[model samples]
Target: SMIFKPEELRQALMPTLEALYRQDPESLPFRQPVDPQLLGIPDYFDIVKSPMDLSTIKRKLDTGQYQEPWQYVDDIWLMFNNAWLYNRKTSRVYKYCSKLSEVFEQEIDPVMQSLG
Candidate 1:
């Protein structure tokens, strides 16, 4: 988030989690303050194992239409963590992160510093 420093990202992960929950509540079974809620972590097997048509998601990330760099960063973390938790693998998250990394270093950071 633009309001938080890098070190605070994880602690402030709930907002991003909330966004994802709102977006696809069926995919996720856990609620806010996800820290202690891992006792009954949602069944993520299908989420990591199933095939997903993420074409629209990729387009949104590439076009910088759906989120800010920070929000995207948090989304990436969630994807990675979800995959890892389920002992699964997916290229969708990796691909978006790669593009966002370039965008952050080459465009977002500079544009943020620029007055106009």
Candidate 2:
């Protein structure tokens, strides 16, 4: 299921990404201190901001050719289209989120076990 291929899967998912890209503000996920109270609302936005490129993400997701759209999205979404428009700042933030399963194993699960 993790396999990326074809076009439709990528295409269908792209609209959601474009909408996300349009919404701007904030930066790096790691350094940013997020209030846990608001987690339910903007929750995973930090991670979502990581790989964002409207047309390219659309194209990649559309094709479903790559195993991971993340790498491709990273390459395309760098913030530097110049003056008029700027893209997502959470690339590293998203990357940090992606790596969080490992973080949970280290910091979260152990702590929970201690309390349990």
Candidate 3:
């Protein structure tokens, strides 16, 4: 966030999407006209939810090992992907990750699944 100032802990997202807009205009709907203003957090959720293959998230996530939000977000996202992709059978666990503990419960363990 801008909270860290020069050490900015978070950031306003735009560049990557814009780059994609520049890269290809026809493929990424809502990405047309290279509108960074149209992009937002929920749009990201929709992107992931809409035909998301775990592999896609995995690659981006793994690569962001040194980045902010991405680093933690990737781990969180990977948790959701793994849960959604592989563990869909466990009724209690799901792919919903709007919060931390939910990520743990739905994508991670049973909350009490471990002792650590």
Candidate 4:
């Protein structure tokens, strides 16, 4: 269980999201939900069973869907892992996922350690 109250958790988590969004070079790719139809990848859902993204994470946070900090972190990992599974290693999206996942780990590690 987390030591934070709902508001405190939100306060702690939101900045982590913001830092990810501001990651240098680019963070725009994962800022919104993946649109299979728009991206012309109609088979995306078939490969990625549990689709996730930053917007969804923010929604869940605001709506009290995350009971523990791990749940929040897991969603972030799921977003990256889904991309890695669906996209090839040489693809642009896959590269961004690698970079952002590293940033997420660095940014969230301290927060989680402190929260516990």
lDDT of each model, Cα atoms only?
Answer: 0.39, 0.39, 0.34, 0.85
User: Among all windows of ten consecutive residues in candidate 2, which has the lowest summed lDDT?
Assistant: 79-88
Error of 2 at 101 (Å): 22
Per-model TM-score, in order, reads 0.29, 0.28, 0.26, 0.91
Q: What's the TM for model 3?
A: 0.26
lDDT of 1 by residue, 1-116 (tens): 34434324333333433344344423242222223236454654444543222233344354444334455444444544554455324544344434333333443344334312
Residue 12 lDDT, candidate 2, scale 0-100: 39
Off by over 4 Å in 3: 1-65, 95-116
Best-first order by TM-score: 4, 1, 2, 3
Those runs of model 2 whose alpha carbons end farther than 4 Å from true positions after fitting are: 1-16, 21-53, 79-116
Clash number for each model: 0, 7, 2, 0
Clash pairs of candidate 2? Answer: 4-64, 5-64, 6-63, 7-62, 10-61, 10-62, 11-62
Q: Considering every candidate listed, which one attains the maximal TM-score? A: 4
Cα lDDT, model 1, residue 68: 40
In model 3, pairs of residues that clash are 1-9, 1-10
lDDT of 4 by residue, 1-116 (tens): 43556676788888888887887655787888889999999999899988898889988888877778888999988998998999999998899889888888889988987787
Q: Which ten residues in a row have the lowest lDDT in candidate 3?
A: 2-11
Per-residue alpha-carbon lDDT of model 2 for 1-116, expressed as tens digits?
A: 45544553344335435444433431233222343356453543444344333444445565565464454434333422210132244554444333432332343333223323
